[PDB]
Design a protein around this nucleic acid. Structure first.
Ligand SMILES: O=c1[nH]c(=S)[nH]c2[nH]c(=S)[nH]c12
Ligand SMILES: [Zn+2]
Length: 271
DNA sequence: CTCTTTTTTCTCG
DNA sequence: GCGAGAAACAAAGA
């Protein structure tokens, strides 16, 4: 998932599990708890969920007075809220059991991670990850964004994917944002003129906020949180190889950029 | 059978 | 420091 999908999961968890006492925690894949599963089980059993936050693509469970469980879903992580008798599924790894259901974390590729840290370690934790600003008008300052672009010879798509200019874009939304802003993904950022940077800045905010509003992009679903999204019906380029661009009618092309599949309109996004 | 495809962090030169 | 490539892992498609 990308930021909009994580925000959608965050919102459903906030509505459904805040106030719930963790009755027990179990793992079939304890090694994905980077701070130690047995330690986490000892610390969090019996505590109540107070809130769910997010920073970039990271989910943050606020548990008890002092605990923060930082969860990253990476490529394929999925949470679901299940009955206590729900059958095990093959790629389920962890579960937090409440009195009237359980929150199960599943992840085919096993990339996702859990880290238990304290409240006052959250801000230093994200500083150490070098996460950039949230993609909002209030936090995403165009002036710094522009100065960083002007200094760099990096290509715009890999630089945006670093999470350092702005947090939350992944392969789907960076391709959508670049199409919307009419920027070729291989453009060196120091070649972007001010008006292109302005359009890019606004487009990042607008695309991600639209995606949040539509509940993220779910291709297929299953019973998982976040699976009722509608943003996939709005994608203009991602996964549209060979289809016609909706602005100019040229076929969308797919290339590889810094090892990522990359979809763009060659007319609208001039090299 | 092989090769390729689908977020973060590392090695290597 | 950089970029290229690959690793972590599993599955599906050519
Ligand atoms: O954290 C990241 N750092 C880099 S350098 N590239 C990249 N691409 C995605 S998606 N996430 C990240
Ligand atoms: Zn076009």
């Amino acid at each position: 998932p990308e930021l909009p999908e994580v925000e959608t999961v965050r919102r459903e968890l906030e509505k459904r599990i805040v106030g719930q006492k963790i009755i027990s925690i179990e793992a079939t894949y304890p090694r994905m708890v980077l701070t130690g599963f047995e330690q986490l089980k000892k610390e969090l059993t019996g505590k109540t969920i107070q809130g769910i936050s997010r920073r970039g693509k990271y989910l943050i469970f606020e548990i008890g007075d002092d605990f923060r469980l930082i969860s990253h879903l990476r490529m394929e992580g999925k949470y679901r809220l299940a009955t206590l008798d729900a059958p095990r599924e093959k790629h389920d790894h962890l579960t937090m059991k409440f009195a009237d259901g359980q929150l199960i974390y599943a992840d085919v590729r096993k990339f996702g991670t859990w880290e238990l840290i304290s409240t006052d370690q959250v801000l230093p934790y994200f500083l150490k990850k070098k996460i950039g600003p949230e993609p909002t008008y209030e936090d995403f300052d165009e002036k710094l964004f522009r100065e960083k672009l002007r200094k760099s010879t990096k290509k715009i798509k890999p630089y945006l994917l670093e999470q350092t200019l702005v947090a939350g874009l992944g392969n789907i939304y960076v391709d959508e944002v670049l199409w919307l802003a009419k920027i070729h993904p291989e453009k060196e950022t120091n070649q972007l003129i001010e008006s292109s940077i302005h359009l890019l800045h606004d487009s990042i905010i607008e695309i991600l906020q639209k995606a949040i509003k539509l509940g993220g992009s779910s291709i297929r679903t299953y019973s998982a949180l976040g699976s009722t999204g509608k943003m996939q019906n709005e994608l203009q380029v991602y996964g549209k190889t060979g289809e016609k661009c909706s602005r100019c009618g040229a076929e969308i092309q797919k290339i590889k950029v810094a090892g990522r599949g990359t979809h763009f309109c060659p007319v609208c996004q001039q090299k």
